[PDB]
Design a binder for these strands. Structure first.
Lengths: 213, 793, 125, 39, 820
RNA sequence: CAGCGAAGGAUUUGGUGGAUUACUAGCUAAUAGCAAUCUA
C-alpha cells in the first residue's frame, strides 16, 4: 500500500532512557498510564468546560488561569480536581501531595473498575454538577426561594467542590485515606449510584428547585 | 487569490520630464518617477504602466496615432512600449543624457537630442513582430557645439529645428535632397536657446532663449537669407525662462519661468494674452493640446501638475503629489478613495479610479502620522507630531474636534472605536495611551502599564477591546468598556511594531523586530501561530554604508502589517523594497512584490556595481474593503496592486464536459441555471457576463434561489465589480434583490466570506443608483410644485 | 572549536544554563543524568521537551544543564525551559530553519512557557 | 525645518492674477457645505 | 509552418560554428563577424560585446564571409549578401547554380569563387559608391591550370590582380583584362590555407601535410619552409607590431607560434579548441596589436595576448608566452535541458550533452556565464572521492530552480544521467552546492522538484520512492514509498500542502504534505512520462504513453481535459503563465498549443528539427524551445501578448472565439438603462456652475422632430454633445411668446424616457430645464400646451419608482444582512 | 587510532579577464567623408 519512512536509523541515546519513557513519544498519557483519546464528555453543555483535549503528563501545569473570567474552563479537569483537593488550612499549597494522591486514586479507580479513570472522573463531573438551583429572592428578607437555572461553569465548579469535600468528610476519621475515599466517590459518582455525597447533594439541590419552582 | 498585479500609482501626478497629451487630447501622459501615468480626463479614469525604468525618466513621446510610446530616462535608456497592448516592445540604450525625443507628425520617424547630436531613427511598426533590432537609424547630425536642449518638427515632417546650450539653433531637412533648403543656423541670443518653432505656414521661425528674448526670423532681404525682423523681450528680471512651447495653429506661445509665473502670448504681434502663477517653484514643463485649448504645466519640486484652459480662465485640474513623504494611508469604508497622511503636514483624499485628489486638509502644523476612518466614512481621525489628534467631517470638510493631552507629547498612532465614542492614541515618548471621548472633547483616561513607547494601537471591530503593543516586547489587551478596567499583558520575544487585528476581533497579529509575525488568540491569551519572515525580505544595499546587504540589520522586519477582510491573509511592508503577503492558516509566503527598481532610490540594489538619496520604504499597507487589492504607501507613491479575473484561467471543479461550447449550448437550450453554474466552473469573466445577461427577468429569482452555496461569493463579487460601471442598473438591482431575498441568511451567518462582496454591492447602490434616484425624486417634486401652485404676475 | 549553544531557563528564583553541542546524545542535569531529576513526579515535566518532538532530535546532540537557586518545582520548570529553548537555538544555528520553527511550533502549541517565562509581576489595580 | 531635517533619518525634500490655488479641499462640487445648525 | 501565436525572435547562446570568421576595422577599433548557422554576429574585439546580429535568417547556411570597413559580405547558397549594421544593403545573385564558397574584396572588385572552379568578378559602377554591385566578368580555373580553388586572396600593391590558391598551384589573375598572368610551379602536397604576409608580395601557404611555405609571389620561388610533422594546418596569421611572429593553427586544436627572424618556436598553446569540432578554425592577429583572436567549431571565440618581455635589455629573445584574455562561448553540444531562472525573463539555465550547465542572458549576451563545478569542502572534514583528473558531471536529465531563498542556500536541484544522486547548485554564486541528495534505493534519479518555500527538495528515483531533503542543511526529512516503477514527476502545491506524484506505472498519487497521509490515488490508462504543475490554478498536465496530454486538477483529483492529436512521443510541454494554454512538442516534428478552457488545439508548427524542450517564460513574454540539432536555444515571442488570438481549432460567436463579450446595450425594453459613457456626466451637468466657480443644428432638429413627431435624432444629438454645449442649448430655448420650443423639448424628453435608455441623462435634462427656465413654466402655468406636455411627461415619469423601491429594498436588506 | 580517501590534501595570497542596468560599431569641421591624411 503506502507507508512513510520518517526516521532512518533506530534512535539510541547515550543517556539510557527507560523503555516506557521513550514509548511515551507516540502518545501523551497522564502519568504515562491513562490515555486521553477516546475520553469524551458524555453530556453536552459541559464539553467546552471540562477540558480533555490537550493531553498532559502530570497534573501540574503551572499556567495562569485566574486572570480572566472563563479561562479556568480550559485548565485540564484533572488539574482542577487536584487544585480543589489541596484546600483547607491543613493542606494549603501542597500541590505535590495533591498530585500524588490523584495518581494513587486513578490507579485504584482503574484496578477496581477496569476502565479508563479519566473517563470515570469526567463521568463523575458530568453526573455531579447540578442542573438547577434556588436563589433567595429577598423582598427585604422574605424567606422564599425561587428556582433558577445554573450555568455550566458553575456546574463544573460545584461538581469538583462536591466531589472533593465529599472525599474529605468520607475520609474524616475512618480507616480509609483521601485517595481511597476519593476513588470510591468518583466511581459511585460516575455510575450515578445515589450512595455518594456529591450526587445526593445534587439530588437535594435539584429537588428543592423543583419544589419552589 | 494571490495573483496580484501592479494596477495603479496614486499620489504623485508629476515628478520629472515632459507632459504629453494624446492626439485627441483626452488623456495626458505624465512622467511619475520611473513609471508613466496616463490620466483619462473625460472618461474619468487613470492607469499606470506596469514597466519600470531603472532611473528617473526624463523624456516622453507617443505618436499621434496613439499606438506606441517611447520613454527615455536620465541616462538614455529608452523603452518603446505598445500603448494599446500596454506591453513593452524594445529596450534601447542611447549612450548619453537625452534632452528631448519627438515623433514626427506623420508618425514614421522619431528624433532625439542625445548630447550634441540630433539623431533621427525611424519608427518600427506596431503590427510587426518584435525583432532583435527594430529601430533602423535614419541619420545622426552633429552641428551644435554644446548640448541640444530642444527639438521641433515642422508641420509636414520635413524639417526639424533644434535648439542648443550653444547659443544657436539649427534647421535640418530630413532627407538629403532638401539639404539646401535647410542649412542655416540662427545666432544672436545671449543665453541658452530654450525653444525654436515654426509658424503655421513655415515661413517665420521663432527662437526663444533662457534670458528672455524671442526672435522672429523671416526669409527677407535687408538676396533673401533669413534676417531677424523683431526681437521681443519678456522683461522678467530675476526669473528666467524654464520651458517654452508654441501652438502654431492658434499662434499661442506658452512660457513658464523659474518663479512659478507663466505667461502666454500671441506670438508674431507679442501681445500678452495672460500671465499667472503656478506657485513659487519653477515651471519645469509646458505642454499644449492638439487643438491648443489646454495647457499642462508641471512643476517638479512640489510634484504638481496643472492643466488649464486659457480661454475660459479655469483649471481643468490642480493635482499636487507627495514624493517620499507619506506616513499613512486608509481606504474609505467603500474602496472608492484612499486618504493619505503626509509628512509635510496634510491630509489628501485621492480617488482611486480617476487618479486625482479630491480634498486636501492642512490644519496640522507638523507631520501627520496616522489616519483612520470611522462612522462608516463620515468621519476621519488623524494624529500628528504637533501634539494633536483631530477629527474631520468628510461632509462639511471641517475639523470639528481637536484632542490634546496635558503633557505636550507627539502622537504616532491612533485607534477609534467602532461605535465611535472614543478615540485613542499612542506616542513614542510617553508610554501611556490617551483615551478621549469624541462626543465631548475631554481626556477620558490615560491608560498606563507599558514600559516602552506604544508603537501601535487597534480596536477590535466586533467586541471592542483595545490592543496596544509596544517596544517593551509586549502586546497588551485592555477591556475599557463597562466596569472592567481589565488589562491582559502578552509578552513576546522582541519589541513590537505594527500590531493588527482580525475582522472578527478573535485574533491579533503582531510584527516584531526579530522579523516575525506572531498571531495570538485574544480571549485565551496564547499564541496561535507565527510566520518567520526575515528571510523572504529584500533588503538592498545603500550607497553610503560599508556593510553588505546580507549582514545589514536595517530592514529585515515589517513595520506595517494588515489582515485581509476574510481574515485569511496578511500583507506586510517595511523599510525594505519587498512587500510580502501570506496566508495565516498555513503561515507560508503567497507572494512577494518588489516595490521599486529605481536605482535613483537608495535601498533597491542588493549588489552595487563595483565599477542622501531617498531610501525606498513602505510606510503603510492596507487591503481594499471592497475589491481584492491592496495599497502600499511607498516613497514613489501609493502603489495599488490588484488582481483581475480577465486573465488567469483558474477553474473550479470543471470536468471534461464543462466547456464554453457546452455553456452556450446550455444557454441556447435555455437551461439558465446550468449555464450559470457551467460559467462559474469555468470561472471565465466573459462567459459569466454572457450567461448573466442572457438570463431573462422572468426567472431571475428561480436561478438566484437555485444557485449553489459555493458559487454565492463568486456571483456577488461579479455583480459588484460589474455593476459599478455597467449601465444595466435595473437588471443589476433585480439580481441583487433576488440574491439577497433568496439567500440572505447564508450571507448573514457567513459574514466574513461575503464581507468584501457585500461592501462592493453597497458601493453600487449608494454611489450610482441612489444618485439617480435622488435626481428623479427632485424632478418629481419640482414638477409637483411647478404645476400645483400659483404663478400669476 | 565545536558548534555549541547556551540558553537560560528561569522560574521564580531558579535559573538553569543549558549548553547544547553536537555529540552522541547524552542529556545531563547537574552532572547526573536527566533520569535522576527529583521530585520524580515532575520528571515528566522535565521530559516533555524530549517527548514532544521525539528523541531523534536528541540522538545527535548532547545537552548539559546547570541549575542553581529556587526550589524543587522552580528548578524543574527552569530545566524544561532551558532544554526547550536550547534545542530551538541549536536547530536555528546549526540545523535548518524549517526544523527550527517546527520545534517552535510544537513547543508553542504545547505551552509557550517552555520558551517565554512569565516574568514581571504584579498588577496594581 | 532645518533642525528637524538634520534630526531625522529619512530624507525630507527642501503680481499676476492668481497662484492657481493648486492646493484646495472641500471640492466634490460642494457649495453650501455648512451645517443646518451653522446656518 | 508559420504560426499565429509565437513568432521567431533569436537563437541565443551561439558564438561560432566553425566558419572562418572575418575581422574588420572601423578606425582604430576592431570588430569580429562570426557565422552562427544562418546569421552572423558582430563582436567588439576590445571587449567581445555583441554589437549586431544580421536582421533576417538567410535561406541557407552562410559559408564564406568577409568584412571591409562598414560592410560585411556573406556568401550562402548561390549569392553574396552585402550587409551594413546587420540590415542587408544588396544581394548579388550569381548566374550559376554552383555554390559560392570563397570570396575576396579589393578595390572596386568583389571576387567570389564557386565550387565548380569558376570565379565571378563584380565591379563598382563609379569608384565613389560603397560596394561592388554590377557584374563584370567570369574567370575559370580549369583542370590544366590548377586543382580545386582552396583560397582566394589579394596580396597588397598588386594593381587589379588576384592570387588564386588552388590545391596544388598558385595562379595570379588580372581581373580587369580577365587574364592569367602567372601560374607557379606545383606543390608536392595539397595546400589548405593561405594568408598574405605584411612583407611585400609574399603569401604564406599551409598544406595538408605539416608545412608552412612562404611563397614569394613576384619571384615565383619559396622563401622559407616551416615543418610541423603530422599536423594539418588550418590557420595562418602574422604579427604586425614590430615583432615578426607567425601563428599557425592546427586542426588538432593547437596554436603554434614561430619567430621568423631567429627561426625558433616561441610557444605552443595545446588544446585551444576541440579537435572533434574542427580544431582552431580561424586565428588572426588584430593588426598592430599583440592580441590574437581564435575561434573554433566548438562554439567558442577566444583572445590571447602577448605581454611585453620580462627582460629589460634583451626582449626579442625572451618572449613571454601568450596568455589568455577575454573569450565568449556557449554549448559545444546541443542543450539537453532548459529552465528559466527568474520571473523577470532575464536569465535562463541550460544544460547540454557536453556536460556543462550554462546560464544564458536574454538581455545582454555578455552576462552569459558557465555555472562552475568546483566542489565545496566536505562538511565533517573527511576526504571527497572521485578521480584526480577532474571531468564534468554526467549530462543533465532534469533540473528544478526555485529562487525563493536565493543567496541564502542551495537553489537549483539537478538530476544527471545514470547516477543515483541529485546535485544542488547556487544560482547567486553561480556554482555547485554542498549537497548531493541520494535516492536511498539504488535507483537512478528520474525526477526532481523543490517547493516554493525553498526549504524542501524532492527526489524521485527509478525504483519508485520519493525522498524529501532539506535544501538548507542537506539531510533526509521524509521518504514516501507509493510507486513501484519509476517516478517521473513530482510537484507540490504553492502552499506546501498537497503534493502530487506521477510514475510510469500510470498512477498519480495525491499526498497531504504537512500530515504525511495520502489523499488519494488515481490510475490512468498509460505510463506517465512527464508532469508539469501549474501552481496558481493547481492544474497539472501529464504526458501519457498513449500520446495524449491529461490535464488534471489536484484539488478534486479528476481528469478535467484530455488532449489528443500528437502522432509520436511527447518530448516536452509547458503551461502558459496565466495557465490558459499548454504548449507541447513531440517527435512528429511538431509544436502544438492547446487552449485548455475549450480543450482544443489553437496552433501548430511543423519545425524541421524535433523540439526536445519547451518552456514558457514566467511572464507571458517568450517561449524557449530546444531542438535536436543546434547548440543554442531557439526563442519565440507570443504575438498574443500584443494582440488577441482566436481560440478556434486548426486542422491539418466570434466574441466567444476571442474570449470577449461586448455587453449589449439594453437587455429589455422594460428595463431602465443608464448611458454608455462616464458616470460623472450626470454630476457635471447638475453642478457645472459651482464646479467651474471652484476651478442651429439643435433648433432645426427640434423643429423637424416636432413636425415628424419623432425626436430620435434630437435625443441622439443631446446624448452626443458636451456639458457646456448641453447647458448652452437648454438655456436658450425661446421662452417668450407662444412657448413652442420648451414644449417640444419636454415631449422630446417624454419620447426619450419612454425608451428606458440614457434615462439618467433625460432626468438631468429635465432638471436643467426646470432650473434654467422653470420660472416661465411656473409663470404660464395653466397654459394648455405646456400643461399637457408636463402632464404626459409625468404620465411616463411616474413609473420611475420601480428604481426607487428597488434600491430601497437593496439598501435596507443589504444593511440588515451585513450588520445584523 | 577508527573512519573518509582514483597518478595527492589543506590554508593563505598577488595579478588579469568576464558580470555587477537591457547588447544598434571608431574618428571628424558630420545629411557626408576618413579610417594610409587632411592639405595645395
Amino acid at each position: 500500500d503506502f507507508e512513510v519512512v520518517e526516521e532512518f536509523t533506530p534512535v539510541v541515546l547515550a543517556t539510557p532512557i527507560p523503555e516506557e519513557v521513550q514509548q511515551a513519544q507516540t502518545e501523551i498519557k497522564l502519568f504515562n498510564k491513562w490515555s486521553f483519546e477516546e475520553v469524551e464528555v458524555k453530556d453536552a453543555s459541559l464539553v467546552d468546560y471540562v477540558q480533555v483535549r490537550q493531553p498532559i503528563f502530570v497534573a501540574h501545569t503551572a499556567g495562569r488561569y485566574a486572570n480572566k473570567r472563563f479561562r479556568k474552563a480550559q485548565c485540564p479537569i484533572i488539574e482542577r480536581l487536584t487544585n480543589s483537593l489541596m484546600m483547607n488550612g491543613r493542606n494549603n499549597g501542597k500541590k505535590l501531595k495533591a498530585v500524588r494522591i490523584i495518581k494513587h486514586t486513578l490507579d485504584i479507580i482503574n484496578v477496581l473498575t477496569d476502565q479508563n479513570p479519566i473517563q470515570v472522573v469526567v463521568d463523575a463531573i458530568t453526573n455531579t454538577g447540578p442542573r438547577e438551583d434556588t436563589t433567595r429572592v429577598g423582598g427585604g428578607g422574605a424567606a422564599r426561594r425561587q428556582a433558577v437555572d445554573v450555568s455550566p461553569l458553575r456546574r463544573v465548579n460545584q461538581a469538583i467542590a462536591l466531589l472533593t469535600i465529599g472525599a474529605r468528610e468520607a475520609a474524616f476519621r475512618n480507616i480509609k485515606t483521601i485517595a481511597e475515599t476519593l476513588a470510591e466517590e468518583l466511581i459511585n459518582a460516575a455510575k450515578g449510584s445515589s450512595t455518594s455525597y456529591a450526587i445526593k447533594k445534587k439530588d437535594e439541590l435539584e429537588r428543592v428547585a423543583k419544589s419552589n419552582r | 487569490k494571490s495573483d496580484f498585479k501592479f494596477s495603479n500609482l496614486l499620489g504623485t501626478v508629476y515628478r520629472q520630464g515632459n507632459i504629453t497629451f494624446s492626439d485627441d487630447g483626452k488623456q495626458l501622459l505624465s512622467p511619475v518617477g520611473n513609471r508613466v501615468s496616463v490620466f483619462d480626463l473625460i472618461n474619468n479614469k487613470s492607469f499606470t504602466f506596469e514597466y519600470e525604468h531603472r532611473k528617473n525618466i526624463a523624456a516622453i513621446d507617443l505618436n499621434k496615432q496613439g499606438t506606441l510610446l517611447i520613454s527615455i530616462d536620465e541616462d538614455g535608456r529608452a523603452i518603446l512600449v505598445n500603448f494599446k497592448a500596454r506591453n513593452v516592445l524594445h529596450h534601447f540604450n542611447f549612450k548619453e543624457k537625452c534632452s528631448a525625443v519627438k515623433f514626427s507628425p506623420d508618425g514614421r520617424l522619431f528624433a532625439l537630442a542625445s548630447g550634441r547630436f540630433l539623431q533621427i531613427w525611424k519608427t518600427p511598426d506596431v503590427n510587426k513582430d518584435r525583432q532583435f533590432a527594430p529601430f533602423v537609424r535614419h541619420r545622426v547630425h552633429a552641428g551644435h557645439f554644446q548640448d541640444i536642449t530642444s527639438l521641433t518638427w515642422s508641420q509636414d515632417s520635413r524639417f526639424i529645428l533644434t535648439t542648443s546650450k550653444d547659443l544657436s539653433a539649427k534647421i535640418w531637412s530630413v532627407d538629403s535632397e532638401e539639404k539646401n533648403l535647410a542649412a542655416t543656423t540662427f545666432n544672436g541670443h545671449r543665453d541658452y536657446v530654450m525653444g525654436a518653432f515654426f509658424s503655421h505656414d513655415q515661413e517665420k521661425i521663432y527662437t526663444v532663449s533662457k534670458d528672455g528674448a524671442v526672435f522672429v526670423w523671416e526669409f527677407t532681404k535687408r538676396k533673401y537669407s533669413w534676417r531677424i525682423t523683431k526681437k521681443h523681450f519678456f522683461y522678467a528680471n530675476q526669473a528666467k525662462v524654464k520651458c517654452v512651447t508654441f501652438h502654431p495653429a492658434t499662434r499661442l506661445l506658452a512660457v513658464g519661468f523659474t518663479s512659478g509665473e507663466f505667461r502666454l502670448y500671441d506670438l508674431p504681434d507679442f501681445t500678452l494674452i495672460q500671465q499667472l502663477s503656478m506657485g513659487q517653484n519653477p515651471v519645469n514643463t509646458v505642454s499644449v493640446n492638439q487643438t491648443g485649448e489646454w495647457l499642462a504645466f508641471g512643476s517638479s519640486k512640489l510634484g504638481q501638475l496643472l492643466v488649464y484652459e486659457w480661454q475660459s480662465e479655469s483649471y481643468i485640474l490642480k493635482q499636487q503629489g507627495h514624493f517620499d513623504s507619506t506616513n499613512s494611508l486608509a481606504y474609505s469604508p467603500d474602496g472608492s478613495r484612499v486618504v493619505t497622511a503626509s509628512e509635510d503636514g496634510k491630509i489628501k483624499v485621492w480617488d482611486i479610479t480617476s487618479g486625482f485628489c479630491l480634498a486636501t486638509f492642512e490644519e496640522h502644523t507638523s507631520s501627520v502620522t496616522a489616519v483612520q476612518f470611522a462612522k462608516r466614512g463620515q468621519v476621519m481621525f488623524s494624529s500628528s507630531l504637533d501634539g494633536t489628534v483631530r477629527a474631520w467631517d468628510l461632509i462639511r470638510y471641517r475639523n470639528f474636534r481637536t484632542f490634546t493631552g496635558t503633557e505636550r507629547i507627539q502622537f504616532n498612532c491612533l485607534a477609534v472605536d467602532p461605535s465611535g465614542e472614543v478615540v485613542c492614541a499612542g506616542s513614542l515618548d510617553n508610554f501611556d495611551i490617551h483615551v478621549w471621548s469624541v462626543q465631548t472633547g475631554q481626556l477620558l483616561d490615560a491608560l498606563s502599564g507599558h514600559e516602552g513607547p506604544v508603537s501601535c494601537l487597534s480596536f477590535s471591530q466586533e467586541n471592542s477591546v483595545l490592543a496596544s503593543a509596544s517596544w517593551d516586547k509586549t502586546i497588551r489587551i485592555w477591556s475599557i468598556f463597562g466596569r472592567s478596567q481589565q488589562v491582559e499583558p502578552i509578552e513576546v520575544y522582541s519589541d513590537v511594531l505594527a500590531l493588527s487585528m482580525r475582522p472578527d476581533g478573535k485574533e491579533v497579529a503582531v510584527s516584531t523586530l526579530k522579523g516575525q509575525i506572531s498571531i495570538f488568540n485574544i480571549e485565551d491569551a496564547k499564541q496561535v501561530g507565527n510566520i518567520d519572515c526575515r528571510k523572504d525580505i529584500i533588503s538592498g544595499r545603500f550607497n553610503q554604508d560599508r556593510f553588505t546587504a546580507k549582514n545589514s540589520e536595517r530592514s529585515k522586519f515589517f513595520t506595517t502589517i494588515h489582515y485581509s477582510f476574510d481574515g485569511m491573509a496578511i500583507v506586510a511592508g517595511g523599510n525594505n523594497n519587498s512587500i510580502c503577503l501570506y496566508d495565516v492558516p498555513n503561515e507560508v509566503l503567497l507572494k512577494r512584490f518588489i516595490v521599486s527598481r529605481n536605482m535613483a532610490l537608495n535601498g533597491t540594489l542588493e549588489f552595487l556595481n563595483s565599477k542622501m538619496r531617498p531610501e525606498v520604504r513602505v510606510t503603510s499597507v492596507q487591503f481594499s474593503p471592497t475589491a481584492n487589492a491592496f495599497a502600499a504607501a511607498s516613497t514613489e507613491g501609493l502603489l495599488i496592486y490588484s488582481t483581475n479575473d480577465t486573465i488567469l484561467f483558474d477553474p473550479f471543479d470543471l470536468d471534461v464536459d464543462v466547456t464554453p461550447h457546452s455553456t452556450v449550448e446550455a444557454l441556447r437550450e435555455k437551461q439558465f441555471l446550468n449555464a450559470l453554474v457551467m460559467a462559474f466552473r469555468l470561472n471565465e469573466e466573459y462567459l459569466i457576463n454572457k450567461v448573466y445577461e442572457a438570463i431573462p427577468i422572468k426567472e431571475i429569482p428561480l436561478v438566484a434561489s437555485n444557485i449553489p452555496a459555493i458559487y454565492l461569493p463568486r456571483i456577488l463579487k461579479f455583480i459588484g465589480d460589474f455593476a459599478i460601471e455597467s449601465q444595466h442598473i435595473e437588471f443589476n438591482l433585480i439580481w441583487i434583490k433576488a440574491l439577497l431575498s433568496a439567500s440572505g441568511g447564508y450571507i448573514n451567518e457567513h459574514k466574513y466570506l461575503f464581507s468584501t462582496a457585500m461592501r462592493s454591492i453597497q458601493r453600487f447602490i449608494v454611489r450610482v443608483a441612489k444618485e439617480v434616484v435622488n435626481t428623479t425624486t427632485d424632478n418629481k417634486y419640482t414638477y409637483r410644485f411647478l404645476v400645483s401652485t400659483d404663478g400669476s404676475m | 572549536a565545536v558548534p555549541s549553544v547556551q540558553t537560560f531557563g528561569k522560574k521564580k528564583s531558579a535559573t538553569a544554563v543549558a549548553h547544547v553541542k553536537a555529540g552522541k546524545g547524552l542529556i545531563k542535569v547537574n552532572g547526573s543524568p536527566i533520569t535522576l531529576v527529583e521530585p520524580e513526579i515532575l520528571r515528566f515535566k522535565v521530559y516533555e521537551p524530549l517527548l514532544l518532538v521525539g528523541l531523534d532530535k536528541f540522538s545527535n546532540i548532547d545537552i548539559r544543564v546547570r541549575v542553581t537557586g529556587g526550589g524543587h518545582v522552580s528548578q524543574v520548570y527552569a530545566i524544561r525551559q532551558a532544554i526547550a529553548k536550547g534545542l530551538v537555538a541549536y536547530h536555528q544555528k546549526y540545523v535548518d530553519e524549517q526544523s527550527k520553527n517546527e520545534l517552535k511550533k510544537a513547543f508553542t502549541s504545547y505551552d509557550r512557557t517552555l520558551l517565554i517565562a512569565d516574568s514581571r509581576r504584579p498588577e496594581p489595580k | 525645518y532645518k533642525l528637524d531635517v538634520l534630526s531625522s533619518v529619512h530624507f525630507v525634500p527642501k503680481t499676476p492674477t492668481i497662484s492657481m490655488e493648486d492646493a484646495q479641499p472641500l471640492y466634490m462640487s460642494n457649495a453650501s457645505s455648512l451645517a443646518p445648525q451653522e446656518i | 509552418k508559420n504560426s499565429k501565436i509565437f513568432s521567431p525572435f533569436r537563437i541565443i547562446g551561439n558564438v561560432s560554428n566553425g566558419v572562418p570568421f572575418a575581422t574588420g576595422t572601423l578606425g582604430s577599433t576592431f570588430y569580429i563577424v562570426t557565422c552562427v548557422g544562418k546569421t552572423f554576429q558582430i563582436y567588439d574585439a576590445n571587449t567581445l560585446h555583441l554589437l549586431f546580429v544580421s536582421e533576417k535568417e538567410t535561406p541557407s547556411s552562410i559559408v564564406a564571409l568577409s568584412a571591409h570597413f562598414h560592410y560585411v559580405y556573406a556568401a550562402y547558397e548561390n549569392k553574396v549578401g552585402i550587409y551594413k549594421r546587420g540590415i542587408e544593403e544588396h544581394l548579388l545573385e550569381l548566374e550559376t547554380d554552383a555554390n559560392v564558397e570563397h570570396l575576396c574584396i579589393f578595390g572596386d572588385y568583389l571576387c567570389a569563387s564557386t565550387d565548380d572552379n569558376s570565379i565571378f568578378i563584380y565591379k563598382k559602377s563609379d569608384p565613389q559608391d560603397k560596394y561592388p554591385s554590377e557584374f563584370y566578368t567570369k574567370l575559370t580555373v580549369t583542370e590544366i591550370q590548377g586543382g580545386e580553388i582552396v583560397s582566394l586572396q589579394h596580396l597588397a600593391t598588386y594593381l587589379n590582380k588576384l592570387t588564386v590558391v588552388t590545391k596544388s598551384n598558385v595562379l595570379l589573375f588580372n581581373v580587369r583584362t580577365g587574364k592569367l598572368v602567372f601560374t607557379s610551379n606545383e606543390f608536392p602536397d595539397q595546400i589548405t590555407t593561405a594568408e598574405p604576409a605584411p612583407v611585400l608580395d609574399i603569401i604564406a601557404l599551409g598544406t595538408v601535410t605539416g608545412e608552412v611555405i612562404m611563397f614569394n609571389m613576384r619571384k615565383g620561388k619559396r622563401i622559407r619552409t616551416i615543418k610541423i610533422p603530422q599536423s594539418r594546418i588550418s590557420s595562418l596569421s602574422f604579427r604586425t607590431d614590430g615583432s615578426s611572429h607567425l601563428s599557425v593553427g592546427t586542426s588538432s586544436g593547437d596554436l603554434i607560434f614561430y619567430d621568423l627572424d631567429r627561426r625558433s618556436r616561441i610557444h605552443v598553446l595545446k588544446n585551444i579548441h576541440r579537435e572533434s569540432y574542427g580544431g582552431v578554425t580561424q586565428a588572426t592577429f588584430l593588426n598592430g596589436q599583440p592580441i590574437i583572436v581564435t575561434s573554433g567549431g566548438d562554439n567558442s571565440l577566444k583572445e590571447y595576448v602577448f605581454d611585453p618581455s620580462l627582460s629589460q635589455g634583451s626582449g626579442d629573445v625572451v618572449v613571454q608566452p601568450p596568455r589568455y584574455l577575454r573569450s565568449r562561448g556557449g554549448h559545444s553540444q546541443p542543450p539537453s535541458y532548459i529552465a528559466f531562472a527568474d520571473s523577470q525573463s532575464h536569465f535562463m539555465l541550460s544544460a547540454s550533452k557536453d556536460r556543462s550547465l550554462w546560464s544564458f542572458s536574454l538581455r545582454k549576451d555578455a552576462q552569459s556565464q558557465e555555472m562552475s563545478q568546483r566542489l565545496h569542502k566536505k562538511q565533517d572534514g573527511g576526504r571527497v572521492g572521485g578521480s584526480t583528473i577532474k571531468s564534468k558531471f554526467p549530462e543533465i536529465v532534469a533540473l528544478a530552480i526555485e529562487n525563493a531563498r536565493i543567496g541564502e542556500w542551495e537553489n537549483i536541484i539537478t538530476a544527471h544521467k545514470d547516477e543515483k544522486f541529485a546535485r544542488t547548485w547556487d544560482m547567486r554564486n553561480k556554482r555547485v552546492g554542498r549537497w548531493t541528495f541520494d535516492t536511498t534505493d539504488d535507483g537512478f534519479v528520474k525526477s526532481v522538484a523543490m517547493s516554493q518555500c525553498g526549504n524542501f527538495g524532492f527526489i524521485g528515483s527509478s525504483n519508485g520512492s520519493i525522498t524529501i531533503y532539506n535544501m538548507q542543511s542537506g539531510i533526509l526529512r521524509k521518504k514516501y514509498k507509493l510507486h513501484k516503477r519509476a517516478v517521473t514527476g513530482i510537484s507540490l502545491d504553492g502552499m506546501n500542502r498537497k503534493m502530487v506524484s506521477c510514475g510510469l506505472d500510470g498512477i498519480v498519487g495525491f499526498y497531504d504534505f504537512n500530515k504525511s497521509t495520502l489523499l488519494g490515488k488515481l490510475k490512468l490508462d498509460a505510463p506517465i512520462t512527464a508532469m508539469v504543475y501549474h501552481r496558481s490554478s493547481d492544474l497539472f498536465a501529464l504526458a501519457l504513453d498513449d500520446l495524449s496530454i491529461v490535464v488534471i486538477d489536484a484539488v478534486t483529483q479528476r481528469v478535467v481535459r484530455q488532449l489528443w492529436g500528437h502522432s509520436n512521443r511527447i518530448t516536452a510541454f509547458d503551461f502558459s503563465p496565466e495557465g490558459r494554454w499548454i504548449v507541447s512538442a513531440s517527435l512528429d516534428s511538431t509544436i502544438r498549443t492547446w487552449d485548455l478552457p475549450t480543450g482544443g488545439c489553437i496552433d501548430g508548427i511543423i519545425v524541421d528539427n524535433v523540439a526536445t524542450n519547451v518552456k514558457f517564460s514566467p511572464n507571458g513574454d517568450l517561449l524557449a524551445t530546444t531542438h535536436v540539432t543546434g547548440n543554442g536555444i531557439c526563442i519565440w515571442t507570443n504575438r498574443a501578448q500584443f494582440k488577441t488570438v482566436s481560440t478556434r481549432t486548426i486542422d491539418e460567436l466570434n466574441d466567444i472565439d476571442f474570449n470577449t463579450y461586448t455587453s449589449l446595450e439594453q437587455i429589455d425594453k422594460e428595463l431602465l438603462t443608464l448611458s454608455i459613457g462616464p458616470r460623472s456626466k450626470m454630476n457635471t451637468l447638475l453642478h457645472l456652475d459651482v464646479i467651474r466657480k471652484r476651478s442651429s443644428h439643435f433648433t432645426k432638429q427640434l423643429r423637424e422632430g416636432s413636425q415628424s413627431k419623432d425626436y430620435s435624432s434630437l435625443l441622439a444629438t443631446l446624448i452626443n454633445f458636451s456639458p457646456a454645449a448641453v447647458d448652452l442649448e437648454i438655456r436658450s430655448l425661446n421662452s417668450f411668446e407662444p412657448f413652442d420650443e420648451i414644449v417640444w423639448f419636454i415631449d422630446a424628453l417624454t419620447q426619450g424616457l419612454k425608451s428606458n435608455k440614457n434615462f439618467e441623462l433625460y432626468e438631468t435634462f429635465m432638471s436643467l430645464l426646470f432650473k434654467a427656465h422653470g420660472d416661465v413654466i411656473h409663470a404660464n402655468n395653466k397654459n394648455q400646451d405646456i400643461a399637457s406636455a408636463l402632464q404626459n411627461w409625468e404620465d411616463v415619469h411616474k413609473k420611475e419608482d420601480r428604481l426607487d423601491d428597488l434600491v430601497k429594498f437593496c439598501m435596507g436588506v443589504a444593511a440588515f444582512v451585513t450588520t445584523a
